[PDB]
């Protein structure tokens, strides 16, 4: 188990329960002394958090011809924040908060991490990026960090197979109940979230 | 006894031989035991769907002669005893005087010891108001032989002294039209007894008995069993001074005839004297049954004294005999039920609780059923018949004959008969009886008045008020039975219409009365019946209101997820006359959208423009908060609308000052921009937008609080009066008037209580008065505070500060800028 210790973690619209700076700290500690290392938020609705926390990112049924298919994270938890919500009303007409996940993966898998200047959509990327990772799209185990789009913020595909071989524990960065659309407040990352937060250094030259 | 429906339909039509009461009684003096004697002896039985039981049908016969001591017009010797439930505490006020309006006698239970105890009082006070008759019964006597081991005399000079208490509130109270009320134990108006043992008796009981060993017409033989009249038992001579001639004193009639009998048994049985025992009892001629024989200690004569002197023939005899039929009554008490003319034609049918005369029903309660979470109406018929089928207008609290506000022209599914737990359908009923109706729970919140002339005016109205004023989290204290909160709750709201349950945003589940006490209750009844689990509950709230006080300074804008959706918008005022309106089903959400704008553009002076754009209401789609589409050529418009609406709705019911529900606020949106393509711009898409947009403006119109406020009705006694403003001066109370019952001393005070200033106020006020005071209060309207929301400091932002750390929200107030575009 990688959550730390301190009593069963669930995912609530009052907050993510059992989870607190602290115990982050020490997950993310013993995250690393088992040689896992952080590469970037995803932000998505409670259920699904409970899923990917416990039950493990899955790639569940996918277009296969579908070549940018893969489990998408973001470096800054801004970006990763604006999907931590419901995508769609429950029947009376909520929106619910969602919850923000900080994905780790074996240290080993590094190598296959590559990124690129190139907006992931434009014509160029597919090419660029299948030149940088070795083989043609989908990804695989390797991972692709590029602008979101032209100039936006930059986000991060872990292939499927290696997006399952990862290991998610919830981020110590509250959504807001009363604010669901509203933009990540910047001084609600916790100070000791941010300090175990860099991200890896990803290659931009093919191996 | 069992009856079929004709009989009861029978009996029932035969009003002068109804008897319309209640009991008034504290808990602690066996009202409840009394009153099941009662039942235990004519109870009423039919020859599945069951209700909360409202009222207890009760049948007496009594012979020919006696039928001939009822001085009011009579037929037959059969009754029909109508006993409606009444309340437990005092508290209660607004029931207690609804079970009152709809009895015309009322059977008060006095305690031996004790005496009239404060509370019973005050009751027979509001009793009197009414112009209930009254009819007395000195309980828990035994009390005073096992006890206090009190003499024959001390006993009579106590239950002297009692009588004359009684008679000074109801000579003081009752109204001089009526004539003197007072109780007279020589007039059989005076029962004595013990519910706990089971026995009772009125001097009339003893003089039908001593009635010809001494050749009297029971006449002057009931009228010598009291005060001083004596019987020398050497002389066998009847005297009126306490002494023969040598001055040797003379024990009094009752003491002799009545007490002593009883008082013998008592020391007979409670000293085991076996050889005693025996020949006194076949001196009084009672006859043990087997298994009854060899009884001893209280267990012996308990058996003994309930087949002596049946408790509950004592209180019947007083009833059938002495209370007024709904005929005798309604003639005096006709004029004080009608706020309409006294010579109406509607007042006159009920003075001569005429059966043939346009309806003139009272729905005093509305009952929990089995029958689903329906609920039937009770009440009573003063004129006019109704009938299953029949088609009446319903009309309610503010109906008036002019408009047509608050009627429901609609017809009665059933006609039903109260029999305490169970209901039996009836064709029809005719005036003068109590009844229940069947299908009017959708029109009738809790009191009302049923007719048929178009010209009927409603009959004096009970204010009540389902306005959550005040309302609890409730948590299961063991998360396993959160299951069987989740049911409780749901049951809870089944059984009371003024009682609500929901779930916030937070996922809490909250539990909303009408008033602290009532709120009280509601959650005892959750924790131990609905529920039965042990539940934790937060401290009492009051329900507050967000709005604002003028146009939002700037357009508000908002852009969803996508980025690819805007909502630019400015929220209003709503003025109260319209928000008002709103919540008075003039302004209806259901209307047509052309002739409700009409409405408010005549009446209420708004552009026929815009009110035909009116998109929706809320909360709940009803609320006095409206949104307004002044877009102008937005393509796809109506796609976003359902989600509009639904971020309405959200946004209205807990807004950004706290996460209190929004009044009075009007939305405008200015215009929008959406996607071409309607997959983006979905519920998950323009909700959020909307709902912030929303909050972004409100948050630009200048944000206010509003605080709910009651208007209490208070009854006191000239003399303690004073401790009424005493206590309203420290609760930020405000006097709307003092009047006084012309004849009475009693005054009739009414003033706005602000409701989070009134927790504990009956507490108080019980102090403030000594008890004396008899409190009433409904909600009546919403006050803006003027203060700040925004400012901390403020009485306001007091308010928000406290709550907002307690829902645990970020302490300060979202500034506009959170919720409107981040650019
Ligand atoms: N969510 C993020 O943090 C994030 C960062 S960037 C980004 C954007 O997401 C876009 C694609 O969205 P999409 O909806 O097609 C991705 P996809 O369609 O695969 O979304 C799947 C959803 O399933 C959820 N889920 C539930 N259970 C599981 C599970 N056990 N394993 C994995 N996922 C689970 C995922 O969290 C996600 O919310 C990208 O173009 C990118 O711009 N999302």
């Given at each position: 188990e990688f959550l730390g210790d301190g009593g069963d973690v669930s995912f609530s619209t009052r907050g993510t329960q059992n989870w607190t700076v602290e115990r982050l700290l020490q997950a993310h500690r013993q995250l690393e002394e088992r040689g896992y290392v952080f590469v970037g938020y995803h932000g998505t609705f409670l259920e699904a958090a409970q899923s990917i926390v416990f039950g493990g990112v899955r790639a569940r049924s996918q277009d296969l011809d579908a070549i940018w298919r893969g489990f998408y994270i973001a470096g800054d938890p801004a970006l990763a924040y604006g999907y931590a919500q419901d995508q769609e009303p429950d029947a009376r007409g909520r929106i619910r908060n969602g919850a923000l996940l900080r994905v780790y993966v074996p240290r080993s898998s590094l190598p296959g991490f590559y990124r690129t200047s190139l907006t992931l959509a434009a014509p160029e990327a597919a090419g660029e990026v299948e030149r940088l990772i070795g083989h043609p799209l989908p990804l695989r185990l390797d991972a692709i960090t590029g602008p979101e789009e032209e100039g936006g913020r930059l986000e991060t595909i872990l292939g499927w197979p290696l997006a399952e071989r990862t290991v998610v524990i919830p981020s110590a960065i509250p959504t807001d109940p009363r604010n669901?659309?509203?933009?990540?407040?910047?001084?609600?990352?916790?100070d000791k979230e941010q300090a175990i937060s860099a991200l890896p250094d990803y290659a931009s030259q093919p191996g | 006894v069992a009856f079929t429906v004709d009989q009861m339909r029978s009996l029932m039509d035969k009003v002068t031989n109804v008897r319309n009461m209640s009991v008034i009684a504290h808990?602690?003096?066996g009202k409840s035991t009394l009153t099941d004697s009662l039942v235990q002896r004519a109870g009423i039985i039919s020859a599945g769907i069951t209700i909360k039981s409202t009222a207890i049908s009760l049948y007496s016969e009594m012979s020919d002669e006696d039928v001939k001591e009822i001085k009011q017009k009579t037929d037959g010797n059969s009754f029909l005893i109508n006993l409606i439930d009444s309340p437990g505490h005092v508290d209660f006020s607004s029931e207690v005087t609804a079970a009152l309006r709809v009895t015309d006698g009322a059977l008060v239970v006095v305690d031996t010891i004790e005496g009239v105890c404060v509370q019973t009082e005050t009751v027979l006070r509001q009793a009197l108001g009414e112009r209930i008759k009254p009819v007395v019964v000195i309980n828990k006597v035994d009390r005073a032989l096992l006890e206090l081991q009190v003499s024959k005399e001390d006993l009579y000079q106590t239950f002297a002294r009692t009588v004359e208490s009684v008679n000074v509130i109801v000579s003081t109270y009752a109204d001089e039209v009526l004539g003197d009320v007072q109780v007279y134990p020589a007039r059989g108006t005076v029962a004595f007894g013990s519910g706990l043992h089971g026995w009772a008796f009125t001097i009339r009981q003893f003089a039908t008995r001593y009635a010809k060993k001494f050749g009297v017409d029971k006449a002057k033989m009931m009228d010598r069993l009291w005060g001083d009249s004596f019987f020398n038992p050497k002389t066998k001579k009847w005297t009126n001074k306490d002494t023969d001639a040598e001055g040797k004193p003379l024990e009094r009639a009752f003491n002799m005839f009545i007490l002593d009998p009883i008082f013998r048994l008592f020391t007979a049985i409670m000293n085991f004297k076996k050889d005693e025992i025996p020949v006194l009892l076949e001196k009084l001629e009672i006859v043990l049954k087997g298994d009854e024989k060899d009884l001893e200690g209280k267990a012996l004569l308990k058996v003994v004294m309930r087949k002596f002197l049946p408790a509950a023939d004592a209180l019947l005899e007083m009833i059938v005999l002495h209370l007024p039929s709904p005929v005798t009554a309604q003639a005096y008490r006709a004029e004080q039920l009608?706020?309409?003319?006294?010579?109406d034609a509607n007042c006159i049918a009920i003075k001569n609780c005429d059966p043939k005369a346009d309806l003139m029903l009272y729905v005093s309660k509305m009952v929990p059923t089995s029958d689903k979470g329906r609920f039937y109406a009770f009440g009573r018929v003063f004129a006019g018949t109704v009938k299953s089928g029949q088609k009446v207008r319903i009309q309610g609290p503010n109906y008036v004959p002019g408009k047509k506000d608050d009627l429901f022209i609609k017809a009665i599914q059933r006609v039903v008969l109260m029999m305490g737990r169970f209901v039996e359908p009836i064709d029809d009923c005719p005036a003068g009886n109590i009844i229940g109706l069947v299908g009017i729970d959708q029109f009738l919140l809790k009191t009302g008045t049923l007719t048929t002339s178009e010209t009927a005016h409603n009959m004096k109205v009970m204010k009540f008020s389902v306005s959550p004023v005040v309302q609890v989290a409730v948590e299961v204290?063991?998360?396993?039975?959160l299951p069987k909160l989740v049911e409780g709750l749901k049951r809870l709201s089944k059984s009371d219409p003024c009682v609500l349950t929901y779930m916030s945003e937070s996922g809490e589940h909250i539990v909303a009365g009408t008033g602290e006490l009532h709120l009280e209750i509601c959650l005892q009844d959750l924790e131990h019946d609905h529920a039965g689990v042990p539940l934790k509950i937060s401290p009492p709230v009051v329900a507050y209101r967000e709005t604002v006080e003028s146009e939002s300074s700037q357009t508000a804008l908002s852009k969803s997820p996508n980025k690819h959706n805007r909502i630019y918008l400015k929220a209003e005022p709503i003025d109260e006359e319209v928000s008002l309106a709103i919540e008075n089903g003039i302004i209806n959400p259901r209307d047509d959208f052309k002739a409700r704008a009409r409405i408010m553009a005549d009446?209420?002076?708004?552009?026929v423009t815009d009110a035909r754009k009116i998109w929706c209401f809320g909360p709940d789609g009803n609320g006095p908060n409206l949104v307004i589409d002044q877009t102008k050529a937005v393509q796809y418009l109506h796609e976003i609308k359902d989600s509009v609406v639904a971020a309405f709705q959200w946004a209205t019911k807990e807004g950004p000052i706290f996460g209190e529900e929004m009044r009075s606020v009007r939305v405008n949106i200015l215009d929008v921009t959406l996607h071409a393509d309607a997959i983006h711009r979905g519920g998950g898409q323009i909700i959020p937008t909307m709902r912030r947009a929303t909050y972004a403006g409100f948050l630009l119109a200048d944000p206010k609080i509003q605080e709910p406020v009651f208007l209490v009705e208070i009854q006191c006694p000239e003399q303690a009066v004073g401790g009424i403003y005493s206590v309203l001066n420290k609760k930020r109370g405000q006097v709307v008037s003092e009047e006084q019952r012309p004849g009475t001393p009693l005054f009739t005070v009414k003033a706005y209580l602000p409701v989070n200033e009134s927790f504990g106020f009956t507490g108080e006020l019980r102090q403030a008065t000594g008890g004396q005071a008899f409190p009433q209060m409904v909600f009546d309207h919403w006050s803006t505070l003027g203060s700040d929301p925004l400012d901390p400091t403020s009485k306001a932002g007091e308010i928000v500060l406290a709550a907002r750390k307690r829902h645990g929200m970020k302490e300060e107030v979202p500034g506009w800028q959170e919720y409107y575009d981040k650019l």
């Open positions: 669901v659309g509203g933009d990540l407040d910047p001084s609600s990352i916790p | 808990v602690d003096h009608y706020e309409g003319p006294a010579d204290k063991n998360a396993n039975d009446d209420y002076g708004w552009d």
